[PDB]
Paper text:
Here, we present crystal structures of IiPLR1 from Isatis indigotica and pinoresinol reductases (PrRs) AtPrR1 and AtPrR2 from Arabidopsis thaliana, in the apo, substrate-bound and product-bound states. The crystal structures were captured in the apo, substrate-bound and/or product-bound forms. We found that, for all 16 structures we solved, each enzyme adopts a similar head-to-tail dimer conformation, strongly suggesting that each PLR/PrR functions as a homodimer, consistent with the literature that TpPLR1 exists as a dimeric entity in solution. Each structure contains a head-to-tail homodimer, and the catalytic pocket comprises structural elements from both monomers. β4 loop covers the top of the pocket, and residue 98 from the loop governs catalytic specificity.
These well-defined loops twist as an “8” shape and cover both the NADP+-binding and substrate-binding grooves. Similar conformational changes of β2 loop and α10-helix can be seen by comparing the structure of AtPrR1_NAP_ + PIN with that of AtPrR1_NAP and the structure of AtPrR2_NAP_ + PIN with that of AtPrR2_apo. Therefore, the entrance and orientation of the substrate in AtPrR1/2 is more tightly controlled than in IiPLR1.
Numbering used by the authors:
A (entry chain C), B (entry chain D): 9 to 317
The structure:
C-alpha cells in the first residue's frame, strides 16, 4: 500500500487530489498547519478528509523538523502549493519541503505543485507572469540537485478557469450574449476537468512508467480551439453568441498599467490562446496521462459545459 | 410543494439551509449574485446546488427590481446574510431585501438572518458586539413596518464555534492540554449542530404553528455548562485537561484596546458564558424547535465531538 502525503490538502486542486488518493486506495496523509485558526472552511475540510479515512499530520513550514517528521511517514509526497497571483503565489515555500525531503531520505517520489503550463518551455514569458515559471523551475532545480525522484504533472487548463467561462477573463460562468474571441480563435488549447487531473495524479504517483518523467495531461477529445469551445456552448443552448475578435496588440495594450495579478492573467492567456503553448509541441502516448491511464473516462467539455445549463 | 428562496445561499449557515430545504422537499431557489467574480468556491457551490435540484435565480442587491423579480417566484424567503464581525457583518443590507419583499406583495413568510442570540433580549450589550443586536432589531422593525409575516429563528450556539473548540477563542479545535474555563464553568449554554439548525429552519418555515413567532432552538440534551462540555471531551479522550478559571473582570480586562472583531467576540462570549443569556429565561414547547419537530434526532455533543478524536 502506497503512503502519500498531500501538502496543500485544502487547496483548490489539493483537496481534489486528497480525495482521489483515497479513492485510488492509497494510505493518504494530509498536512494540517496550525495557523488555520478561525478559517472554519479549512478546519471542516480536514474533518471531512478524516471521515474518508485520511490521517492528519500536524506540521508547519516554519518548523523544519516537523516537515521532516511528516515526510518520514510516507512513500510519496504530493505538493499542491499555491501558484496563482490573484489567489496567492507561494511556490518557493516548497523549498523548505524539498529540504525536509532531502533530510528524511525515505521519500520514493515527490510531485511538486506544477499542474499547468510546462515551466522549462516558457523561458520567453515576460514578467510578472514569468514568476510562475521561474519559481517552478527553481523548485525543479532543488529537487534534482537533491537527487529526489520526481514526477511533473503538466499540460492542461483547469476547466473551471478556462472552459466554464468560454475563456472570458474575470468571470467563471458562460456569458449571456457576447463573447470575446482571442485572435481568430483557431489556436488549439488543452482542457481538463480538475477531478480528472486529480485522478491522473493519484494514478501516476506510484507508476514506474512516470518515475523521473514529465507526464502530460492532454486528453485528445479535450484539445479544442476557443471557437470550438464556444460552438459547443452555442449548440447546447441553441443560441449563437455575438463574437468580437480581439487582436494580439489590443489584448496586450496598456498591460503595463494594470494591477499585477491581472497582468499575470493576461500574460498567461496570451501564451495559451495566442501562442498556443499547450499544443505547439507533440507528446508521446508513453508520457500522456489519458493513454497511460485509459480507465479514466475523462469528462469531455460538452459534458462539462452541460453543468452550466 | 413550498417554494423557498435562500438569499445568502453560499454562506456558512446559508449553504446548510439550502441543502436542508432540498432534503425537506421544498422547491428550492437560490439567489446567485452577479458580483461573484473569480470566487470559484461560490461558483462551484451553486453548481453543486443545481445538481441537487435547486433552481438558480439571478439578482443583485444593487438592482431593486432584480430582487423584486426573485421574491415574486417563491412563497417563503430565508436570509442567511452575514453577521460575524471577523467574517463580515452586513445585516443591514437585508433592508433592501425587505423593501423588495414589500413591493412584491406575494411572500407568505420571511425568515431574516438571526440564528443566534435573541436580539430584543440583548438591549444591555455594549459596543461593538452590540451592533449585531441593533441591526437585527432594525431589520425586525422594518419587517413589521412592512407587514411581512415572519419567523425569527434563535437560541443556540453553532456547534463549530463553541463546542468543537471547548469554547476556546481564536481556535476551532479542542486544545491539547490546557483549557480556559469561564468563571466556574457552571453557566448553562445551548449548543446545536448547524445541520440540525438548518433542518429545523427548513421544517419551521412553512409551519402554521410558527407564523409570526420566535422559534427557539434549545434541544434539551444540548443545554450544557462549559464544564459539562469539557467533561464530555475528557471522557471521549480518557485524559483530564488542565483547567484555568478566568474571572469576569480578567476576561474583559483592556477589552477597549483590542481589534474590533475580537472585542465583539469577547462581548458575545461574556453574554453567553458569564451572563447565561441563552438559558436565563424559559421557553414553552410551543416555541422550541426540538419539541416542535421531534422527528429531528438532533446530534448530541458527545457524538459531535467524536469528529475531533
Ligand atoms: N489551469 C491550470 O492549469 C491551473 C494551474 N494551477 C496550478 O495548481 C497549483 C495549485 O494552485 P491552487 O490549487 O489554486 O492553490 P491554492 O491557492 O488553492 O493554495 C493551495 C495551498 O497552498 C497552501 N499555501 C498557500 N500559501 C501557503 C504558505 N505560505 N505556506 C504554506 N502553505 C501555503 C495552502 O496549504 P493548506 O491546505 O495547508 O492550507 C493552500 O491550500 C499551482 O501550481 C497552480 O499554479 C492552478 C490554477 C489553474
Ligand atoms: N453561534 C451562532 O449562533 C452563530 C450565529 N451566526 C449568525 O448566522 C447568520 C449568518 O452568518 P454566517 O453564516 O456566518 O454568514 P457568512 O459570513 O457566511 O455570509 C453569509 C452570506 O452573506 C451574503 N453577504 C455578505 N455580504 C453581502 C453583501 N454586501 N451583499 C449581499 N450579500 C452579502 C453572502 O451571500 P451570497 O452567498 O449570495 O454571496 C454570504 O454567503 C448571521 O446573522 C450570524 O450572526 C453566525 C455564526 C455563529
Ligand atoms: C494553464 O496553465 C496555468 C493556468 C493558470 C491559471 O491559474 C489560473 C488563472 C491563471 C491565469 O488563468 C486564471 C486566471 C487569471 C486571471 C483571470 O482573469 C482569469 O479569469 C478566468 C483566470 C496558472 C498557471 C498555469 O500554468
Ligand atoms: C450565539 O449567538 C451568536 C454567536 C455569534 C458568533 O458567530 C460566531 C462568533 C460569534 C462570536 O462567536 C464566533 C466568535 C468570535 C470570536 C472568536 O474568537 C471566536 O472563537 C472561536 C468565535 C454571532 C452572533 C450570535 O447571535
Amino acid at each position: 500500500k502506497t503512503r502519500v502525503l498531500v501538502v496543500g490538502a485544502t487547496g483548490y486542486i489539493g483537496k481534489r487530489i486528497v480525495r482521489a488518493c483515497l479513492a485510488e486506495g492509497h494510505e493518504t496523509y494530509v498536512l494540517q498547519r496550525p495557523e488555520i485558526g478561525l478559517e472554519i472552511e479549512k478546519v471542516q475540510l480536514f474533518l471531512s478528509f478524516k471521515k474518508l479515512g485520511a490521517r492528519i499530520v500536524e506540521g508547519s513550514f516554519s518548523d523544519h523538523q516537523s516537515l521532516v517528521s511528516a515526510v518520514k511517514l510516507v512513500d510519496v509526497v504530493v505538493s499542491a502549493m499555491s501558484g496563482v497571483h490573484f489567489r496567492s503565489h507561494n511556490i518557493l515555500v516548497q523549498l523548505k519541503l524539498v529540504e525536509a525531503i532531502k533530510e528524511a531520505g525515505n521519500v520514493k517520489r515527490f510531485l511538486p505543485s506544477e499542474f499547468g503550463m510546462d515551466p522549462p518551455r516558457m523561458g520567453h514569458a515576460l514578467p510578472p507572469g514569468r514568476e510562475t515559471f521561474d519559481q517552478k523551475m527553481e523548485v525543479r532545480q532543488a529537487i534534482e540537485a537533491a537527487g529526489i525522484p520526481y514526477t511533473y504533472v503538466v499540460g492542461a487548463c483547469f476547466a473551471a478557469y478556462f472552459a466554464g467561462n468560454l475563456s472570458q477573463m474575470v468571470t467563471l460562468l458562460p456569458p449571456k450574449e457576447k463573447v470575446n474571441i482571442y485572435g481568430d480563435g483557431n489556436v488549439k488549447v488543452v482542457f481538463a476537468d480538475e477531478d480528472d487531473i486529480a485522478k491522473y495524479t493519484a494514478k501516476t504517483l506510484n507508476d514506474p512508467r512516470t518515475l523521473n518523467k514529465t507526464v502530460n495531461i492532454r486528453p485528445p477529445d479535450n484539445v479544442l480551439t476557443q471557437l470550438e469551445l464556444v460552438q459547443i456552448w452555442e449548440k447546447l443552448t441553441g443560441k449563437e453568441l455575438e463574437k468580437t475578435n480581439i487582436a494580439a496588440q489590443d489584448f496586450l495594450a496598456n498591460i503595463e498599467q494594470m494591477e499585477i495579478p491581472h497582468q499575470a492573467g493576461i500574460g498567461h492567456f496570451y501564451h495559451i490562446f495566442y501562442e498556443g503553448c499547450l499544443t505547439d509541441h507533440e507528446v508521446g502516448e508513453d508520457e500522456e496521462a489519458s493513454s497511460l491511464y485509459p480507465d479514466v473516462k475523462y469528462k469531455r467539455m460538452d459534458d462539462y459545459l452541460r453543468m452550466f445549463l
